[PDB]
Design a protein around this ligand. Structure first.
Ligand SMILES: *[C@@H]1O[C@H](CO)[C@@H](O[C@@H]2O[C@H](CO)[C@@H](O[C@@H]3O[C@H](CO)[C@@H](O)[C@H](O)[C@@H]3O)[C@H](O)[C@H]2NC(C)=O)[C@H](O)[C@H]1NC(C)=O
Ligand SMILES: *[C@@H]1O[C@H](CO)[C@@H](O[C@@H]2O[C@H](CO)[C@@H](O[C@@H]3O[C@H](CO)[C@@H](O)[C@H](O)[C@@H]3O)[C@H](O)[C@H]2NC(C)=O)[C@H](O)[C@H]1NC(C)=O
Ligand SMILES: *[C@@H]1O[C@H](CO)[C@@H](O[C@@H]2O[C@H](CO)[C@@H](O[C@@H]3O[C@H](CO)[C@@H](O)[C@H](O)[C@@H]3O)[C@H](O)[C@H]2NC(C)=O)[C@H](O)[C@H]1NC(C)=O
Ligand SMILES: *[C@H]1O[C@H](CO)[C@@H](O[C@@H]2O[C@H](CO)[C@@H](O[C@H]3O[C@H](CO)[C@@H](O)[C@H](O)[C@@H]3O)[C@H](O)[C@H]2NC(C)=O)[C@H](O)[C@H]1NC(C)=O
Ligand SMILES: *[C@H]1O[C@H](CO)[C@@H](O[C@@H]2O[C@H](CO)[C@@H](O[C@H]3O[C@H](CO)[C@@H](O)[C@H](O)[C@@H]3O)[C@H](O)[C@H]2NC(C)=O)[C@H](O)[C@H]1NC(C)=O
Ligand SMILES: *[C@H]1O[C@H](CO)[C@@H](O[C@@H]2O[C@H](CO)[C@@H](O[C@H]3O[C@H](CO)[C@@H](O)[C@H](O)[C@@H]3O)[C@H](O)[C@H]2NC(C)=O)[C@H](O)[C@H]1NC(C)=O
Ligand SMILES: *[C@@H]1O[C@H](CO)[C@@H](O[C@@H]2O[C@H](CO)[C@@H](O)[C@H](O)[C@H]2NC(C)=O)[C@H](O)[C@H]1NC(C)=O
Ligand SMILES: *[C@@H]1O[C@H](CO)[C@@H](O[C@@H]2O[C@H](CO)[C@@H](O)[C@H](O)[C@H]2NC(C)=O)[C@H](O)[C@H]1NC(C)=O
Ligand SMILES: *[C@@H]1O[C@H](CO)[C@@H](O[C@@H]2O[C@H](CO)[C@@H](O)[C@H](O)[C@H]2NC(C)=O)[C@H](O)[C@H]1NC(C)=O
Ligand SMILES: [Zn+2]
Ligand SMILES: [Zn+2]
Ligand SMILES: [Zn+2]
Lengths: 380, 380, 380
């Protein structure tokens, strides 16, 4: 019933700009196209906001983001996100699922974090590196401040642009896309020793759930074998892998998110062939569409609510939501709204807050959707 | 009574940008300035929307567009459209005619489709070609997919940008401007044989009416003699000419419009001197002002209405409006609104529609304005 | 109580763009970021509008503007204005003063009028000139049409961009920032003889008041000695100086404002060290914060009101407000609103107007705020 995309082709900057603007103009009521800075070579770092209320963060509405093409020659991501912009804009109103999604979530899509790199890439490139780095030749996914290793590559404009952006909005869930393998990689990406060993995050459980939500839907990925004849040593049970255990990555964007914002991000490898021929494109969409969809929905699971100031009766800003035995607290936005991803199980959440008295409620998250929980705090 | 323009000078990109932004800022309630892509040399392809409801297509409100400077060295167009942006913004509210126009129509003006070309042009150039082509040196008016000849020049960014744009909005009437002659040229621009012979379009009659509406108002053009001492072989009865009969043009933007959208476009040659000296500029405006005005009004003539779904009671999207013996159907927008240009005479319109049962009403279009006609269709 | 800035560092274009966009996005309800053109090297000439009604000029709401970094290597301004954008956005709502300001005034901030120049500058530069001029090497502050000397340097894009901008909005008060000295310089900047002599403007009194409002608050400036060991010949009583008397400046932007718009502009020299090391930055903010604040408030002092057409009962556009014995009339905006800066004293204002009969009321401006005065004019 829902309308599938049709524009299945590699989109160079010029056309991606065109494509993007066409949708920004054709559905002005659902979209908001903006830039977040400029690549070294001055190419806009475009993002397509898709909400039934473009431009504004409404209270209790979770903010989600997808990022693709961080590595210039890893193209599948870029195209899939365009396919998505289309699919979403086209089915909004007509299709129940899409309409529901665009209404309940504020989706932000950036098809290419490294557009300069893309332009220097070669179609057909399977495992190469030409165009991977940015214009100054640094790995944008080694360019972020790492928690263990101390990054040395100078901060690149695409990096800075994006860091700022991650601070600008209350991003809850996110996924940045790649190519070179088929698996959804989760935190941590590295370890104190800098070796390929499992490096567990406080939120290990949730992450496994998140990664699986996507991999479960991409059939060949779920199988665990990315490409038996190329990289025959790779085997990922159910298509997900802790980053560090696969191989140590210091300076990545994935862990930065987690460690410096409330956002929880996963790295998705869409296939061993980095830059496949344009003909394969539609197949990549058919294989990831349900995945991309199912993944976004996860932004709703867990717990959410507001931290209301008992005397005003209104939201407190930057209150802290702490959970049972998970050492990764979460903060609240301007309307005191908060979102905390968790797995089915019973927890003990505590709303902390400067100048207020902490409250602790026992909450019960189950298999399905998210539970709403409000914390009213008195002063001192 | 109405206020005439004053900024009579050649505007290079920098200043055209400035000029444009000044009006976008001074009259934010009537204007919306946007880009549609970037020239090869990264210059924005600006468009100025002028509606009393900038940014939105309201149902039953016809969408109109003027495009100029496709050929870099053909400057008169560029300037006239700027003069127009001014004239419109300045008289809105004060002047009855302008106010009426901006309210009833959603006008889109693009002063330069080929800004790179412009910059390489020489003032005073009368028949030359320096700056005509785009930055990669292709004739943007030979760059479109032709119905007879099969175009070979690679698609240029300015072309692609514009094609996309023609798809983005429900353009009803349009006119792209030129220099090198004095006549309004209409479809078709070429023929199966690729020779200078009359090549009739299904809408030949309407086109002649449209072309005349403009030429009738430009005195010297209406006379039929563009410039007796330069190109003395040219004689256009009443200042209009079928394109192909004047000379075969394959790949033009004019015919593309017609054949791929609902938009009906005419090519207007504003004078034999492509790049006249800035001093002549005001005279060109005085001679075309009434023309530019009268032409836009044509967007209202003929027939228009909605294709309402009988069970919902609301507009059907992409229904087809077919006319008596004219083989060039028209589609409806998102609110099921449609606009069909026709000449005074009696027709038999049929609203076709997938999943619905066709209706056929006999309509009567007369000398003056347009007739409103709604088609309510039942399902199956 | 109010929140101070934290981002204390030199911001190159890339980061300034990022910084700016972050605030445009984080506080969309209070801000509106736009460009006014592009530097020679195509860098946007950004401006941050900060009003509780971004994008619209509401009637009777005074329009204010701050401009910095006209001279590439004079950096303090650029940074302070960024600090300000922050400070304002961050305290709006929380802080009473800021909230009041953003509500009553439409503030426009341009951190860098000469971004190309900036990029070619050297941190630590104290009195040098590298990066002062624009990309084509002209002094943007000698590039404006002068009232005495006749400017020869070709008009630069940054100049043109800004001139247009000064025409686009009803700017009432303004201040462009500099480095190389510590004093607030006021009109006129030059004289018929082109020498360093006092060149008095019709509004001399008001200007002295305006300049002092700022200098009084910057302690070391108020002292009158900019930097005793560098430029030991400089002594400015109370930190303000008539421009021309300090030294003849023909072609400046400061006097242009006055002479071609209603805007009254002052030139502020923030310190002898043009490009100090990033470490000093916070100190510069601590020393100018109250100044920048107090200065903006001056936009409210004097007299203001509307020129209502007696028969319509609505505002007349471009009426003239003439004062007692001050030869510098003022015009009204679209809602017939006007703002006239004056000093405590008694005046005799006359509302002139084409097609109407002049009225003259005796008004009394005092020490504190501004007085509202409306002029209803009959026709003829
Ligand atoms: C893409 O950019 C990345 C940087 O973000 C480049 O990776 C860097 O490559 C250099 C060159 O080998 C590495 O430095 C070398 O390290 C060895 C081992 O310690 C040392 O012996 C050498 O003297 C030199 O310092 C650097 O570690 C590495 N950085 C990262 C984060 O991997 C990469 O080369 C670029 N890719 C291409 C194709 O140019
Ligand atoms: C501006 O760009 C247009 C292309 O859009 C250029 O026109 C093209 O010019 C070439 C050169 O003559 C033509 O190709 C030649 O055709 C002849 C005749 O068949 C053939 O014998 C030659 O071997 C060659 O292929 C081409 O047909 C023509 N295309 C069009 C659409 O007219 C034009 O040259 C450019 N103008 C300038 C001043 O550079
Ligand atoms: C920055 O740009 C300004 C122009 O806006 C440059 O100032 C100009 O410098 C030239 C060179 O000396 C001056 O012209 C000379 O004037 C003398 C004296 O009359 C004459 O004898 C020479 O033949 C020559 O014409 C010009 O007056 C001056 N303009 C202004 C407004 O000061 C300046 O040089 C540039 N700065 C740097 C570091 O390049
Ligand atoms: C916990 O705190 C939340 C913060 O307000 C609160 O949200 C508020 O919920 C109420 C009731 O659902 C909404 O009521 C508004 O809309 C209804 C109509 O739908 C009107 O009848 C009301 O007068 C009112 O306008 C609020 O819109 C919503 N937010 C605010 C700011 O009021 C949660 O509902 C609270 N409860 C729980 C269990 O979490
Ligand atoms: C054919 O179908 C058109 C599609 O609706 C229809 O347009 C609608 O016309 C009605 C009546 O003119 C308008 O009525 C609205 O505004 C009036 C006040 O001006 C109110 O009293 C009504 O309650 C209503 O809100 C509609 O705005 C207009 N469009 C829609 C969506 O209703 C044509 O009028 C129809 N008739 C013909 C002869 O073509
Ligand atoms: C001189 O002329 C000014 C131009 O109108 C005038 O401004 C108008 O002032 C009135 C009264 O303060 C305002 O009244 C509006 O708002 C109140 C509620 O706050 C309503 O009760 C009224 O019905 C009305 O909607 C106007 O908003 C304001 N502007 C306009 C266009 O009406 C000055 O007040 C006049 N008087 C003086 C002494 O200058
Ligand atoms: C939000 O909350 C934090 C703490 O709840 C506020 O104070 C510090 O913020 C930093 C942010 O990096 C934390 O690392 C510290 O733990 C917090 N406490 C102290 C003593 O510094 C912070 O000011 C608030 N704002 C932001 C943006 O975090
Ligand atoms: C709108 O209508 C057309 C036909 O009414 C829909 O289907 C085809 O659209 C193409 C468009 O190029 C036409 O050439 C065909 O004649 C139509 N029929 C068939 C069997 O293909 C079309 O899907 C609708 N949407 C658009 C954008 O045209
Ligand atoms: C606004 O008012 C002026 C005069 O009140 C109008 O007419 C002339 O405007 C110029 C503007 O440069 C003044 O120098 C003249 O003194 C005015 N009078 C004459 C006889 O020219 C002007 O048209 C109006 N509009 C603007 C933009 O100024
Ligand atoms: Zn990768
Ligand atoms: Zn032409
Ligand atoms: Zn200076």
């Amino acid at each position: 019933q829902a309308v599938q995309p049709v524009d299945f082709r590699h989109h160079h900057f010029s056309d991606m700009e065109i494509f993007l603007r066409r949708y920004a103009n054709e559905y002005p009521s659902i979209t908001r196209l903006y830039s977040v800075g400029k690549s070294v070579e001055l190419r806009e770092l475009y993002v397509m906001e898709i909400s039934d209320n473009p431009g504004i963060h409404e209270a209790g509405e979770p903010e989600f983001k997808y990022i693709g093409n961080m590595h210039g020659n890893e193209v599948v991501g870029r195209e899939l996100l365009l396919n998505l912009i289309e699919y979403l804009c086209k089915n909004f109103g007509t299709d129940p699922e899409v309409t529901d999604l665009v209404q309940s979530t504020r989706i932000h899509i950036m098809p290419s974090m490294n557009p300069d790199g893309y332009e220097k890439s070669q179609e057909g490139d399977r495992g190469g590196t030409v165009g991977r780095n940015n214009s100054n030749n640094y790995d944008l996914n080694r360019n972020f401040p790492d928690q263990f290793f101390q990054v040395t590559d100078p901060p690149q404009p695409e990096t800075l642009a994006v860091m700022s952006w991650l601070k600008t909005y209350p991003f809850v869930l996110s996924a940045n896309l790649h190519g070179g393998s088929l698996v959804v990689n989760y935190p941590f990406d590295d370890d104190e020793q800098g070796i390929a060993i499992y490096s567990k995050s406080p939120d290990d459980a949730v992450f496994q759930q998140l990664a699986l939500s996507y991999s479960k839907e991409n059939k060949k990925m779920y199988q665990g074998s990315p490409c038996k004849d190329l990289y025959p040593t790779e085997y990922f049970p159910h298509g997900i892998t802790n980053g560090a255990q696969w191989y140590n990555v210091p300076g990545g964007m994935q862990d930065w998110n987690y460690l410096n914002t409330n956002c929880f991000e996963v790295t998705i490898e869409l296939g061993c062939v980095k830059y496949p021929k344009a003909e394969e494109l539609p197949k990549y969409w058919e294989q990831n569409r349900r995945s991309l969809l199912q993944f976004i929905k996860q932004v709703h699971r867990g717990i959410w609510g507001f931290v209301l100031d008992a005397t005003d009766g209104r939201g407190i800003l930057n209150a802290t939501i702490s959970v049972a035995d998970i050492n990764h607290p979460v903060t609240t936005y301007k309307d005191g709204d908060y979102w905390r991803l968790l797995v089915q199980g019973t927890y003990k959440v505590t709303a902390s807050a400067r100048g207020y008295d902490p409250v602790t409620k026992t909450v019960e998250v189950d298999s399905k959707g998210g539970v709403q929980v409000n914390f009213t705090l008195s002063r001192t």
